[PDB]
Structure 1
Amino acid sequence: GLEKTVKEKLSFEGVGIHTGEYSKLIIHPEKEGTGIRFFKNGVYIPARHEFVVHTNHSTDLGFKGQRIKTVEHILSVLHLLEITNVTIEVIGNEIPILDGSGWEFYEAIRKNILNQNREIDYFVVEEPIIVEDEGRLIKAEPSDTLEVTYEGEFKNFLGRQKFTFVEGNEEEIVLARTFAFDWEIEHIKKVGLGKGGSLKNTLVLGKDKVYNPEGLRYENEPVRHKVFDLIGDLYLLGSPVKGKFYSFRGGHSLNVKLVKELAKKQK
């Protein structure tokens, strides 16, 4: 595919799920070879793994004293639409969470794609690889297309579910929202996070209940979201990815570990 950027500036604003603070984004067009990067207080933070600074409950990037929290959803949408050249100006310390999914980003960006004059230089998984961490495990192997499968094992009604994304099924994961269990809310809050969470941007699940009045968008909405999160984390490789991934109970922390592993293998 050809490198892409946006036709014109696109902006989004709202509260950040973790900081509880208001913030805004302005996605700026860029020319071939630029890549995806953020801009905050006069500092450019490339959307690459070398700049990750936190992976608990979100993926945060930082550089020269400037940090930006929760870049996973905007990067996932960008990865899925294959937007390769843009500068994401950030007014705040975190990306707006919006409704908790990538729907708003997806719809806006989708109808503003501008093809450019350069073939995408995809990051291609050359050989099989596995990363583990106390039960959690992610596996990557060669593939002509981006295929991501996530298998979750929850200690609640969700039980054991798995979902597979394949190129062309973008619309099946871009509406899946971020979720949290009532029993982990005190922790998240205690550790300085989740200050902006609500039933309006987060799916709260109990041992056998769903607090959101609207319920689940899909019976397996949670693993679809995990797939969504992983697509965004994979974009930290620097360019659109081509490979087959299988994540069992993975999180941002393991996703990033896998990313640095693939990167290390100068792939």
Structure 2
Amino acid sequence: MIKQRTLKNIIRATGVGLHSGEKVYLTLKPAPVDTGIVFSRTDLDPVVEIPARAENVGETTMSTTLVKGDVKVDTVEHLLSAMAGLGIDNAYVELSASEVPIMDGSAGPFVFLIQSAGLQEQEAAKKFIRIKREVSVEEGDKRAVFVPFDGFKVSFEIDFDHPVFRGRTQQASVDFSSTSFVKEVSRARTFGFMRDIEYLRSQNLALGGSVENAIVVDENRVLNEDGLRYEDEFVKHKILDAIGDLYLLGNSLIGEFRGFKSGHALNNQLLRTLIADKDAWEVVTFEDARTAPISYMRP
């Protein structure tokens, strides 16, 4: 049977909150079968646990935030992308503050942390959600859709005026496995637009934001092409974000996601629309590994 996975070891890291600019202490811990990913705010008394589930997503701009009452965890998308990428079913994520550390602005540092802690197979069937019927949402001319597909395919197109994009759209698609996630998408940084970052900095926001965690762009271009890791890196980052957002399903997905100018808000609308549409998906488990669609990093 394809087994559920947790971490083999407790593993700690330190980084800066993207908005706070202050140190955050991150602890990844093993968790029992059927826990899913649980964020835990250990700076609070009592401790506040928020399951990484679609229903717990708060309404925020340009990042995925989890909310329980007045308590929040900001910027969960990159860590959840790494958890999805290496097939981590079950873990506690402890934080000293309301933000996941931004690290280098990709999932790379998180992949290194999870890899290094090691993958522990657990004595329970891994549950997958198989898309059974097409589900789409539209907002203006933005679109996000799931369709049935035997695998995990994530496709994305973006279209912007800014001269950095050279008058054209950026398109990319990943046929997802642990290997293709790590290689094609995991280190992709987003564009930090100088005009936007300066505006946020005047409000004592994005204090942790810099060339260390974004590709900085001026009125016309990437200032340092040196800092680029991929072609069409911006859309490859959109795929990274999506994989992290789609993991708020609480299980590995079997089907195809196509995003047209989508983002965290519309991804979350699609997710919640799919969950509410009970005949459009089913939970499956696999007794013979060799007939499962998705390749994951061997433990």
The TM-score range, normalised by the shorter chain, is over 0.9
1:250 aligns with 2:269: no
Measure how far apart 1:213 and its partner are. 6.2
Output the TM-score relative to the length of structure 1.
0.94
Quick one: distance in 2 between partners of 1:200 and 1:212? Answer: 12
User: Cα gap change, 1:187/1:134 in structure 2, threshold over 3 Å: closer, same or farther?
Assistant: farther
Indicate the residue corresponding to 2:164 in structure 1: 157
Indicate the residue corresponding to 2:150 in structure 1: 144
Indicate the residue corresponding to 2:226 in structure 1: 214
Amino acid at match of 1:130: S
Indicate the residue corresponding to 1:122 in structure 2: 128
User: Cα gap change, 1:183/1:132 in structure 2, threshold over 3 Å: closer, same or farther?
Assistant: farther
Indicate the residue corresponding to 2:85 in structure 1: 80
Output the TM-score relative to the length of structure 2.
0.84
Amino acid at match of 1:259: L
DSSP-derived class of the 1:201 partner:
coil
Identity of aligned residues (%): 36
Quick one: distance in 2 between partners of 1:215 and 1:94? Answer: 25
1:57-72 correspondence runs (5 A) = 57-72=62-77
Indicate the residue corresponding to 1:108 in structure 2: 113
Q: Is the 8 A contact 2:164 2:222 kept in 1?
A: no
Quick one: distance in 1 between partners of 2:204 and 2:130? Answer: 37
Amino acid at match of 1:166: D
DSSP-derived class of the 1:157 partner:
helix
1:227 aligns with 2:227: no
Give aligned pairs, total. Answer: 267
Quick one: distance in 1 between partners of 2:131 and 2:218? Answer: 38
Measure how far apart 1:191 and its partner are. 6.6
User: Please, which of 47, 56, 73 is the counterpart of residue 51 of structure 1?
Assistant: 56
Measure how far apart 1:95 and its partner are. 0.3
1:181-200 correspondence runs (5 A) = 181-189=193-201, 193-200=205-212
Deviations 1:13-40 (A, max 9, x none): 1111122232121011011111111111
1:92 aligns with 2:97: yes
Quick one: distance in 1 between partners of 2:111 and 2:212? Answer: 19
Quick one: distance in 1 between partners of 2:260 and 2:225? Answer: 29
User: Cα gap change, 1:157/1:65 in structure 2, threshold over 3 Å: closer, same or farther?
Assistant: closer
Is the radius of gyration larger for structure 1 or structure 2? Answer: 2
User: Cα gap change, 1:213/1:163 in structure 2, threshold over 3 Å: closer, same or farther?
Assistant: closer
Quick one: distance in 1 between partners of 2:192 and 2:78? Answer: 16
1:170 aligns with 2:177: no
More displaced stretch, 43-52 vs 109-118: 109-118
DSSP-derived class of the 1:110 partner:
helix
Q: Which has the higher strand share?
A: 1
Quick one: distance in 2 between partners of 1:121 and 1:181? Answer: 40
Deviations 1:209-262 (A, max 9, x none): 212463311121110000000000001112111110110111111111111111
Q: Is the 8 A contact 1:43 1:64 kept in 2?
A: no
Measure how far apart 1:192 and its partner are. 6.4
Indicate the residue corresponding to 1:133 in structure 2: 139
DSSP-derived class of the 2:262 partner:
coil
DSSP-derived class of the 1:74 partner:
helix
Instruction: Give ranges in structure 1 of 5+ residues lacking alignment.
Output: none
DSSP-derived class of the 1:225 partner:
helix
Q: Is the 8 A contact 1:199 1:212 kept in 2?
A: no
Amino acid at match of 2:207: K
Measure how far apart 1:117 and its partner are. 1.4
Amino acid at match of 2:16: V
More displaced stretch, 8-17 vs 188-197: 188-197
Amino acid at match of 2:181: E
Instruction: Give ranges in structure 2 of 5+ residues lacking alignment.
Output: 282-299
More displaced stretch, 212-221 vs 1-10: 212-221
